[PDB]
Each structure stands twice: as structure tokens, then as C-alpha cells.
Design a protein around this ligand. Structure first.
Ligand SMILES: Nc1ncnc2c1ncn2[C@@H]1O[C@H](COP(=O)(O)OP(=O)(O)NP(=O)(O)O)[C@@H](O)[C@H]1O
Lengths: 650, 114
DNA sequence: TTTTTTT
């Protein structure tokens, strides 16, 4: 409600006096209305009755009796014979508690400025008006020192302001306090004028003995010093001195650290509790970054929401795969520690990639999502003192997507383990110091052919997920093929640029995040989808070349007198891999311990020369050459016009 | 100790590819051993470059000393001890050359003087 | 501190 508006410190000044009033006005009709009438006589702008509602009880005297007091305030605001001044309010405050009244009024802005003026004979300096400005404007601005050692200003943005779009109810960064400078030459000038009038009143008093010459000297000196408010160097010195008063010591390091708060175009979205709420009023959460998308609650009757849900049904035909992909993409709005997962999307031609992943990126914005290049995953890493500015593009963001594949790229598994696990990553920002941060990103890679996984350890395969698109988008040549559908170019040209479509998709993402938090305990491994698991299993078995070599080249041989040791089969694997993907020089010791388990452990035996003397299992080492014996060693409901709420099985 | 024994590739090469051939006239200068060990290391261990001289000193400091002798031309030679040069193909005679508590209540604290 | 140029 902002009962004490930050643009008017006299509301806070008057609220202190209303607290200072005796509690006999609390829970009573007549004198409460008398003070309301007096306060409306002094200033009728809905401020002092709001302060009455805040400090004391709003309607405890009569529930539903607000409108009677509103009508009384209206009658006070109209022409009123009686006109009670504010001096009656000061008289009542002094009557209730004189010492408390005095102690309350020493901390006001006018008393601080008047004390400075009287104690320094009208000579005003930088720290004095900096202190007054901090007293009257200290809740709207903040100062902190960044990593480079510079003092940076931050301003809280209110609805009525020349504001960049999406900045409301947040802290915006300022290289200079633009508003404070104007405030000094405007609002502060007004209070200076009030002090001038007070000095004129004290001049209008009788001469007494010698105080009148002192008063004219004070008036002359203050009139000389009053012009310094509009001087550029004086204002610069005032702002420089105000940096030590507006300073908050741990503001920048706290600035975007709550992962349950998300800056959005109409305020701050809080996903701490279900349902998620929209803070569009004053608050104390430090929020700087935001997205341009405004948060509206999820409503399927919206035409854009209906269009987007139909599009989602078009892109992914399987219901369980659609639910899993939506649950996975919903975790992109969270910027905390999440599970070590990675999704690979494979599509032949015109598919839903670059529409869905780019939609997530555009609804999250530049601060919360980013597009990443495939050189971070495929090429070998650089020496860490080089400032990799592409690796710094996932510091404080919860979503990342790769989009480029040259020709069946082979990804570096060390980079995969580095960029997926919930741990710390060390890298150097360009022209900056080497630093460590936390991995909080949900990652999706879209490919056109495939990815080659060289390793077969449990570490890289417990964090890899694979999906293949089953829908081809060919509008002109759309045959009876069910998986074949006619396309609209608008989805890539107009719908992805439309703010209403982005708002609807963000609402869908928030709804699916809440669904994941409700049905499961936010854990995505409990999402039971057989299609994704089966596709990952098939992809893993395709990438595992050990079993393919053992089933293809190694055959059962009855009564075989030939002896095949580990160097022979390692060289056979070397020539097989020469006929496979690429040259791929490897380590023979690790290949020996890797085929140590394999599936030949049943037939493998020990040698007197502490070696491996595996008998039988003659390799073909050519094409065909079939064994005359036998055997092989390698042992060779859809949603009913409704979804996004489906949960009979869970 | 087990890891240091398993990381000694020269001992493994001598055990695997060098066998005590009795009454063998096979002449094996350090260069032959260096080449054989280099292939053995690259084939069994990770392929990597080797220093011929350093390798000669390495193989020199081993059981080879027993069967390693100077030549009339002052050249290190391995008397007999035919090398396998391939899988099996070992000398049966004279066999090969390469020899072939409980926490009770709390575990954080223990015997100060075991 | 980068660009570089390490190569
Ligand atoms: N649900 C949908 N319904 C109709 N048309 C769609 C839908 N999703 C995408 N399209 C269209 O499909 C076309 C293919 O574009 P795009 O999605 O970028 O292809 P892509 O597979 O992602 N990338 P690429 O395979 O290299 O061409 C675009 O013109 C979209 O407008």
C-alpha cells in the first residue's frame, strides 16, 4: 500500500507524530474523527488517515466503519467553516509526552537542518545537507562498493517514474544518483525556503537587547549559502559525501542470491510457496535483474495458452515424453542447485527445435538464460588463465541451450562432468580476476545427426538424456503421414516475438514447475517416462562399441587350440576402431582393464606367467569367415483432449 | 608397495617377453632389449616416446644384469635368454627370467601407542 | 588486461 510514500518524507514525519499521539484516540470514534478533520485541514491527500490506519487500529472501533470515516474526510476536504491547524496536533503531542515529543522531533529533517544552520551561523557545507538528504531520502537509494573498488548507486523504482520497461519494484543500477541531484535543486530548495521563513519570523520578534543584529547576520549568511544548492561542484561534493551515509555493506553480494525470487515485468514473482505470488508493492528483497515478461496466472482458456498447448501437443506426440520435457524445461526458472541432468534433442529436418528452446530462452531473458556455443562441449579445453568469456555466460542463469553441430561432433566428457554436476566451476572473466561460481543451469542441446560418447563409465551416463523428434514439419508437401504436419512460419517469425505468447508460455512454465513441486518432491528422476528411458538405453547401447565388437568379431570355437591374449584383442579393437569413427588414439592399459569386466570374464582365465591366456574365442580378423561350430560369446494412454494435469498413475 | 610394483612396466616386460633359454646362443645387445621394451610399453602401456640411452640404463639396472655381459668389442649383450618376440613362444627350459583392526565403540579415537 | 602471440 506504501502507507509512508518514499516520494514524500513528510508522510513519515507525520506518522511519527501520529504514533506520538496518546492511545486514547486508539479504538474510539469522536476525537479520532477530530484529529482526522484537523489533519485533512492541514493536508487532504489521503496520507494522514492512512497513517491513522497504519499506526493505530483501522476499524477495530467499528468493523466495516471505514466508509463513515471516508465520508467525514470528504466533508473535511470540502469547504469547512472550522479550520484546525497542525499546531493543535503538536499541542496534543506535547500534552501526552513532552520528552517523547522532543526526542521524536530531533530526528526530523527540518530539525537537523535548522540545528546546523543555527549552530554554524548559516554556513552550510557538504556533509550537513548530505545528512539531511539521507534523513529524508534514505529508503529509496543505496550505495555499495563493487569488485573494482568503485561506489555504485542503486535506486528503488516506484510506479510513477520515468522508468525503463520492466524495472518496477526493483533496484536499478546508477553510475550517478540522477534523481538525488534534481531532488537537491528542487525538494531540498523548498525546505531551505521554509528555514528562510523561520528566520524571518524570528527577525519579526522584538529587538530585545542585541539579538536582532545577530539575526540579520544569520539571514544574510543563509541567503548567501542558499544559492550553493544549484552549483555543480557543491552538488558533486554533497553526493560524494552522501556515499558514506547511504552505504550498505553487504548489498551487492546479496543482490541476486535468492533462487525463489524472479524479477518480472510487473514486479517480483515469488515461487517460495504454492501458489506462486506476485509482489507488486514495496518489499525488502534485493532484486536487480529481471525479465521483460509479465506474470499472469496459468489459465488454459486464454487463446494464446490454448495455441501454445496445442503446439506442444504437435511437437511431442508421446504424452509421457511431453510431460517429462515440460517438467525438465520448467526447472529453468529455478537458479539454485539442481540435479545433474542433460538433455540431447535430435531432429532430422524442420522440427520443434529453435522454437521451443528459443521460446524458453526468450521468456527467461538475457539475465536468466543464454545461448551457448558447441565449442564449450566438443573442443578441447583451453589453459585456465586465458579469460574464457564464453564460459562466463552461465554464471547466474538457470537455462542454457546449444544449437550447432558440424558433422556428428564428439563431445568432451570432462566438460560434460564439469558443466552438469552441482559443484563449483573456476573461470576467469575477461580483464578480471579468476573466480569460482556455482553451476545452476538446465542445459539442452539440439543436434542434426548425433553425438559420439567415447566413454562408457557410469559417471557420464547417469547425467545424459536423449530424445528424438518424431514429427516432420513440411507444410507444402504434407502427406497422409500422421507424424507429418503442415507448418506455419509464424511460429518462428511472429509468435516467438509476440509478448502475449511469451507471457502465456511463461505461465505454462510456472504451472509445470508447481506441478513438479506438488506431485513429486521437485525431483525429476521420479518422473516415470518409459519413452525417454528407452531412447537413452538404445542410444547408450549404440554408443557402447565394446559389446558390438564382442558380438561381431569374437566367436565361440569348440576345441580351439589357439591362444588369444589381451594385446591381440586390444590390437584387433584398434584396427576395428580404425575402421570405426576416427583414428582415436587411446590407452591400451585402460582398454585392458575395461575389457577385463566386459562379457568375456566368464571365459577369461589366468596364466602361469601372471598374464591373461584366454583360450578359444578366435577372432575373425576379416570379413565373413564363419565358424563351423556354433554359439556366440556376446549372447546374441494418450490424453483425451486434455493434459498438463494428467496424473492417474502418480 | 602394490601400486609401485604394478607401475613398474620394465619388470612386467622382462617377466612377459624374456624367458631363460638354456644353452641359447641368442645375442641381445641393449638396443634389441630397448626396441622390444619400447614396443611392449607402447603396445601394453600408453604409446609414448622413449630415450634409447635412458632405456638402456633402465633395462641394464634389472635381473638382465645376471644374463647381461660385455662383448669383446665392449658392448652390453644378453647371453641366451631368447626373447618371445610374440605371444607364447616361451622357452620351457629353465622357465622364464622374470620371477613369476575393528572399531569397538567409537572409531574417531584409537590406540595412542598401538 | 586485453589485443596479442604463444604456435
Ligand atoms: N508446432 C508447430 N506448428 C506448425 N509449424 C511449426 C511448429 N513448430 C515449428 N513450426 C515451423 O517449423 C519451421 C521449422 O523451423 P525450425 O523450428 O527453426 O526448424 P528446426 O528444425 O528447429 N532447425 P533446422 O532443422 O536446422 O531447420 C518454422 O518455420 C516454424 O514456423
Amino acid at each position: 500500500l506504501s502507507i509512508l510514500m518514499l516520494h514524500d518524507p513528510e508522510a513519515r514525519y507525520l506518522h511519527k507524530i501520529l504514533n506520538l499521539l496518546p492511545p486514547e484516540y486508539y479504538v474510539e470514534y469522536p476525537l479520532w474523527s477530530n484529529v482526522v478533520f484537523a489533519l485533512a485541514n492541514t493536508s487532504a491527500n489521503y496520507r494522514p488517515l492512512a497513517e491513522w490506519f497504519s499506526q493505530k487500529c483501522p476499524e477495530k472501533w467499528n468493523t466495516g466503519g471505514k466508509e463513515k470515516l471516508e465520508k467525514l474526510w470528504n466533508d473535511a476536504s470540502h469547504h469547512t467553516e472550522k479550520k484546525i491547524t497542525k499546531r493543535s496536533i503538536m499541542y496534543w503531542a506535547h500534552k501526552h509526552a513532552p520528552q517523547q515529543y522532543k526526542e521524536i522531533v530531533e530526528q526530523g529533517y527540518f530539525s537537523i537542518l535548522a540545528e546546523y544552520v543555527y549552530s554554524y551561523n548559516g554556513m552550510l557545507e557538504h556533509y550537513m545537507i548530505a545528512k539531511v538528504i539521507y534523513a529524508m531520502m534514505g529508503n529509496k537509494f543505496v550505495v555499495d562498493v563493487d569488485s573494482n573498488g568503485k561506489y555504485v548507486w542503486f535506486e528503488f523504482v516506484l510506479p510513477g517514474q520515468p522508468m525503463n520497461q520492466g524495472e518496477i519494484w526493483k533496484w536499478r543500477k546508477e553510475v550517478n544518483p540522477d534523481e538525488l541531484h534534481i531532488y537537491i535543486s528542487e525538494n531540498f530548495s523548498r525546505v531551505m525556503d521554509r528555514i528562510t521563513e523561520h528566520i524571518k519570523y524570528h527577525l519579526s520578534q522584538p529587538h530585545e537587547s542585541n539579538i536582532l543584529n545577530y539575526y540579520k547576520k544569520l539571514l544574510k549568511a543563509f541567503e548567501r549559502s542558499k544559492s550553493k544548492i544549484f552549483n555543480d561542484s557543491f552538488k558533486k561534493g554533497v553526493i560524494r559525501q552522501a556515499e558514506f551515509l547511504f552505504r550498505q555493506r553487504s548489498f551487492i553480494q546479496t543482490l541476486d542470491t535468492n533462487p525463489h525470487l524472479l524479477g518480472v515485468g510487473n514486479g517480483v514473482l515469488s515461487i517460495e510457496t504454492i501458489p506462486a505470488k506476485l509482489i507488486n508493492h514495496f518489499h525488502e528483497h534485493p532484486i536487480h535483474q529481471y525479465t521483460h515478461i509479465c506474470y499472469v496466472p496459468f489459465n488454459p482458456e486464454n487463446p494464446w495458452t490454448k495455441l501454445l498447448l496445442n503446439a506442444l501437443q504437435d511437437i511431442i506426440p508421446e504424452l509421457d515424453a511431453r510431460l517429462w520435457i515440460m517438467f525438465y524445461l520448467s526447472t529453468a526458472i529455478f537458479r539454485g542447485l539442481k540435479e545433474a541432468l542433460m538433455l540431447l534433442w535430435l531432429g532430422g529436418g524442420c522440427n520443434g527445435k529453435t522454437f521451443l528452446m528459443r521460446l524458453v530462452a526468450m521468456v527467461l531473458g538475457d539475465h536468466y538464460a543464454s545461448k551457448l556455443n558447441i565449442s564449450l562441449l566438443t573442443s578441447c579445453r583451453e589453459t585456465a588463465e586465458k579469460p574464457n568469456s564464453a564460459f562466463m555466460r552461465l554464471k547466474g542463469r538457470g537455462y542454457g541451450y546449444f544449437e550447432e553441430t558440424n558433422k556428428s561432433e564428439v563431445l568432451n566428457t570432462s566438460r560434460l562432468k564439469e558443466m552438469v554436476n552441482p559443484g563449483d566451476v573456476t573461470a576467469r572473466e575477461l580483464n578480471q580476476k579468476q573466480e569460482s561460481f556455482q553451476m545452476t543451469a538446465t542445459m539442452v542441446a539440439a543436434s542434426n545427426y548425433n553425438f559420439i560418447i567415447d566413454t562408457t563409465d557410469h559417471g557420464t551416463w547417469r547425467r545424459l538424456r536423449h530424445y528424438r523428434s518424431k514429427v516432420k514439419f513440411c507444410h507444402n508437401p504434407d502427406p497422409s503421414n500422421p507424424y507429418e504436419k503442415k507448418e506455419d512460419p509464424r511460429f518462428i517469425h511472429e509468435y516467438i516475438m509476440d509478448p502475449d505468447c511469451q507471457n502465456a508460455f511463461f505461465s505454462i512454465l510456472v504451472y509445470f514447475w508447481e506441478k513438479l513441486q506438488k506431485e513429486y518432491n521437485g525431483q525429476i528422476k521420479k518422473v516415470f517416462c518409459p519413452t525417454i528411458e528407452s531412447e537413452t538405453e538404445a542410444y547408450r547401447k549404440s554408443q557402447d562399441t565394446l559389446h558390438r565388437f564382442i558380438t561381431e568379431r569374437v566367436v565361440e570355437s569348440p576345441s580351439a587350440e589357439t591362444v588369444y591374449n589381451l594385446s591381440e584383442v586390444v590390437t584387433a579393437y584398434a584396427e576395428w576402431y580404425n575402421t570405426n569413427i576416427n583414428v582415436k588414439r587411446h590407452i591400451a592399459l585402460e582398454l585392458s582393464q575395461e575389457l577385463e569386466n566386459s562379457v568375456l570374464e566368464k571365459y577369461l582365465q589366468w596364466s602361469p606367467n601372471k598374464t591373461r591366456i584366454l583360450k578359444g574365442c578366435r577372432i575373425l580378423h576379416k570379413f565373413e569367415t564363419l565358424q563351423p561350430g556354433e554359439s556366440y560369446i556376446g549372447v546374441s494412454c494418450e490424453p483425451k483432449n486434455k493434459w498438463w494435469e494428467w496424473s492417474p498413475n502418480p
